[PDB]
Design a protein around this ligand. Structure first.
Ligand SMILES: [Mg+2]
Ligand SMILES: [Mg+2]
Ligand SMILES: [Mg+2]
Ligand SMILES: [Mg+2]
Ligand SMILES: [Mg+2]
Ligand SMILES: [Mg+2]
Ligand SMILES: [Mg+2]
Ligand SMILES: [Mg+2]
Ligand SMILES: [Mg+2]
Ligand SMILES: [Mg+2]
Ligand SMILES: [Mg+2]
Ligand SMILES: [Mg+2]
Ligand SMILES: [Mg+2]
Ligand SMILES: [Mg+2]
Ligand SMILES: [Mg+2]
Ligand SMILES: [Mg+2]
Ligand SMILES: [Mg+2]
Ligand SMILES: [Mg+2]
Ligand SMILES: [Mg+2]
Ligand SMILES: [Mg+2]
Ligand SMILES: [Mg+2]
Ligand SMILES: [Mg+2]
Ligand SMILES: [Mg+2]
Ligand SMILES: [Mg+2]
Ligand SMILES: [Mg+2]
Ligand SMILES: [Mg+2]
Ligand SMILES: [Mg+2]
Ligand SMILES: [Mg+2]
Ligand SMILES: [Mg+2]
Ligand SMILES: [Mg+2]
Ligand SMILES: [Mg+2]
Lengths: 38, 141, 208, 174
RNA sequence: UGCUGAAAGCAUCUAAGCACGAAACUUGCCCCGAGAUGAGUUCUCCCUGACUCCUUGAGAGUCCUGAAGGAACGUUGAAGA
RNA sequence: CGAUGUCGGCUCAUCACAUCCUGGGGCUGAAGUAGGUCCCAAGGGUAUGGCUGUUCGCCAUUUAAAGUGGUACGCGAGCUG
RNA sequence: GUGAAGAGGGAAACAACCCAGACCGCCAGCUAAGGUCCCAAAGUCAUGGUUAAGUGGGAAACGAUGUGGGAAGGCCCAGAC
């Protein structure tokens, strides 16, 4: 995953989550879009 | 005239029991440190150990608010080259449940010989049982 | 459990195939159980043992009584070993060296040979400074012992000169070769601490 | 809010017992117990159940609507029972069940055994497919996910332990 | 990395709950270690005679008694400045 | 400024983590071998030589690796000069 | 303006910040800044809300169904998300 400080939605299937305080993104399609932090 | 200072030999002390089940650590340890010092008594003197003996029992059952069951760290150096040992409030209760109350009281008591003398008063226990039935220690709240 | 035994030098065993294996000879006379410490009284289960022989005069009444409780002869020294839960022993019971007939690897524990006041070169394997090339009064010395005004002090557990040896040490997982019943011997491979005549707490290897 | 506001049915021969907050449901497949959250409150409404959020607490609805969805599954479990269908896709892979210990062969140096906590009925219709039944979705889904964890699908040939319904992306070799 | 799962009639590793997860952390291995003044325990050993004085006080002496043990001294040591 | 001895080498270290190795992970333009980058990780380990006063550097040959820094550009009542 | 040439109380410690100008004495009372659970004098004081981050008790661009407030406009009983 990418740990950039400005996570954001890159496609339709991507979704924003807050696990253990940290803001993450998760996708159905592309595993590339999976990112953390920010 | 002068004011009445307490005189050790004449100090009629008392014994107490404190059930620490479901108590907040700080709120308890304060109320202990008030008594151990003797400020609850009307004949209080800041150079004399007027305060009472307290038997805190069920030390392992003490409660803490928030995430301090995990997040409360207990740092202590070993006096060695780079030995900085730490421990979480869980890990401290798993190992030595007496230490928890003892530190929280010791911090709140004054420093110095009298401070150390008024800590010796405190008796902490993990189990509900105690071996001081000879004193008939009264239940304090 | 474990047995106390006097060290009796080193020899070797030529195995029938060829190999010559160096062995320490440990004489292990009958370890007599004096006192069975239990959870009821002491708060831990264990046994106290002894061996050899003292003279009926060099021994002191405090210990001459202590043995008379058990009903055994006054063995020189006393040691204590931990039981393994399921085990149980009786007072005035001899333990022969036949415990080690089953097991293969053992730990030997004895006091090392005293070297006295050893320097840093000997004690801590410090490298010796240049024996020539201008050097002045500092060949085998330790050099620097700290930094400067930052710590402003020498840290604890610094490797300096001082006492070397005469301290209890354990050598672990030595292979037993032979366990003689007739002369009460135990032939462990390799070398174990302490000089000839020193006592050795021999016991089954912990690292199974 | 919406899920919590929907009474839960209880079929015949399904004995529910409310020990304060501790709910014990007894059915034909197996008796089950559940310690519930403090913010939720539950009572019997003739036949169906009701999940009330307790006043005073902040996130009552959220916690109640969870418990609703739990007991919804738990009542289904004891009556009907749950199942998971795993398949071992890939050559030289084999599964077996001797009693209640799943013996796997997933192309390793050593055969791996997997124990089954509680009444989890591990079946084997074919030798390269592990069906397994029980009551709790929790334990079944866990055990399935452990049996998966030994070998996740290789995203190339799809080689590994997979679920029946699970579609997989097999990217091309470049 | 997951498993059930609302708020958001779906979805989500988490907000309740539950499971894995590293030479780090705490133990396990080894050593010092009750001056650990919070000075812990178990075992064994040793000591059971009169008297006035008196601010009758954990008072002080007079004779009678000095054990367990220890020290010292010697011979010394693979112990050791 | 009525003196805080300044580079480099030796001896001796110690800490940090912004990790070189070893350990655990995600994504890969990841078939496997080996990588690339990012995340967690400071327990341990981390060359010998030739040239030059050198630090550094270049070269030769190794290594699992030959980490970057702080410590009065650590350490002259420790040595060298 | 303060210090220098101004002590005292507060800002943990802190010439210049805040409060206030020490003639001497007193085991009197009222106040300033700053405070009032314990170290340590005084509110575990009262009323209604906010925060769950140990924020409080170092900090930015930027990131995000974190959470608390009003004000308008979009859609329904021809039944919307
Ligand atoms: Mg996690
Ligand atoms: Mg203090
Ligand atoms: Mg010697
Ligand atoms: Mg050298
Ligand atoms: Mg010269
Ligand atoms: Mg010389
Ligand atoms: Mg010299
Ligand atoms: Mg010198
Ligand atoms: Mg769901
Ligand atoms: Mg290793
Ligand atoms: Mg001077
Ligand atoms: Mg230098
Ligand atoms: Mg890191
Ligand atoms: Mg470790
Ligand atoms: Mg070089
Ligand atoms: Mg200097
Ligand atoms: Mg610098
Ligand atoms: Mg220097
Ligand atoms: Mg220098
Ligand atoms: Mg110097
Ligand atoms: Mg010169
Ligand atoms: Mg010269
Ligand atoms: Mg001037
Ligand atoms: Mg004041
Ligand atoms: Mg102050
Ligand atoms: Mg200043
Ligand atoms: Mg200002
Ligand atoms: Mg002001
Ligand atoms: Mg204050
Ligand atoms: Mg003070
Ligand atoms: Mg006060």
């Amino acid at each position: 995953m990418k740990v950039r400080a400005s996570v954001k939605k890159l496609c339709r299937n991507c979704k924003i989550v807050k696990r253990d305080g940290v803001i993450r993104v998760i996708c159905s399609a592309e595993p590339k879009h999976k990112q953390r932090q920010g | 005239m002068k004011t009445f200072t307490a005189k050790p030999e004449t100090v009629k002390r008392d014994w107490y029991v404190v059930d620490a089940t479901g108590k907040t650590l700080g709120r308890l340890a304060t109320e202990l440190a008030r008594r151990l010092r003797g400020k609850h008594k009307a004949e209080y003197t800041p150079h004399v150990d007027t305060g009472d003996y307290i038997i805190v029992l069920n030390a392992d059952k003490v409660a803490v608010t928030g995430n301090k069951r995990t997040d409360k760290v207990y740092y202590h150096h070993t006096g060695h080259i780079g030995g900085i040992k730490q421990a979480t409030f869980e890990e401290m209760i798993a190992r030595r449940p007496e230490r928890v109350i003892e530190i929280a009281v010791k911090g709140m008591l004054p420093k110095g010989p009298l401070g150390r003398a008024m800590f010796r008063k405190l008796k902490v226990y993990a189990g509900n049982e105690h071996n001081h039935a000879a004193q008939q220690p009264q239940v304090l709240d | 459990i474990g047995l106390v035994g006097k060290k009796v030098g080193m020899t070797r065993i030529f195995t029938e195939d060829g190999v010559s294996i160096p062995v320490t000879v440990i004489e292990v006379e009958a370890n007599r159980v004096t006192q069975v410490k239990d959870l009821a009284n002491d708060g831990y289960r264990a046994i106290q043992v002894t061996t050899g022989a003292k003279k009926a005069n060099r021994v002191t009444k405090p210990e001459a009584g202590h043995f008379a409780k058990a009903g055994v002869e006054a063995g020189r020294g006393l040691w204590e070993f931990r039981l393994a839960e399921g085990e149980e022993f009786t007072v005035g019971q001899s333990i022969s060296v036949e415990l080690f007939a089953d097991v293969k690897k053992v730990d030997v524990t004895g006091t090392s040979k005293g070297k006295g006041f050893a320097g840093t070169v000997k004690r801590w394997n410090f490298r010796t400074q240049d024996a020539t090339h201008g050097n002045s009064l500092s060949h085998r010395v330790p050099g620097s012992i700290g930094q400067n005004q930052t710590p402003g002090k020498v840290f604890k557990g610094k490797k300096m000169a001082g006492q070397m040896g005469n301290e209890r040490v354990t050598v672990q997982s030595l292979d037993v070769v032979r366990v003689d019943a007739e002369r009460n011997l135990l032939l462990v491979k390799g070398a174990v601490p302490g000089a000839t005549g020193s006592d050795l707490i021999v016991k089954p290897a912990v690292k199974a | 809010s919406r899920v919590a506001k929907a009474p839960v049915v209880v079929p015949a021969g399904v004995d529910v017992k409310i020990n304060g907050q501790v709910i014990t449901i007894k059915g034909k497949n197996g008796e089950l117990t559940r310690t519930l959250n403090d913010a939720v409150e539950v009572k019997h409404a003739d036949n169906t159940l009701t999940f009330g959020p307790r006043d005073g607490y902040a996130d009552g609805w959220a916690q109640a609507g969870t418990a609703r969805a739990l007991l919804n599954s738990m009542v289904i479990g004891v009556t009907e029972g749950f199942t998971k269908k795993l398949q071992l896709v890939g050559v030289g892979y084999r599964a077996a069940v001797k009693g209640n210990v799943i013996n796997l062969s997933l192309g390793f140096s050593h055969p791996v055994d997997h124990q089954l906590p509680a009444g989890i009925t591990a079946e084997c219709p074919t030798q390269t497919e592990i069906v397994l039944k029980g009551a709790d979705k929790q334990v079944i889904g866990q055990v399935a996910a452990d049996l998966r964890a030994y070998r996740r699908p290789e995203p190339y040939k799809g080689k590994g332990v997979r679920y029946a319904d699970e579609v997989v992306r097999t990217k091309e070799a470049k």
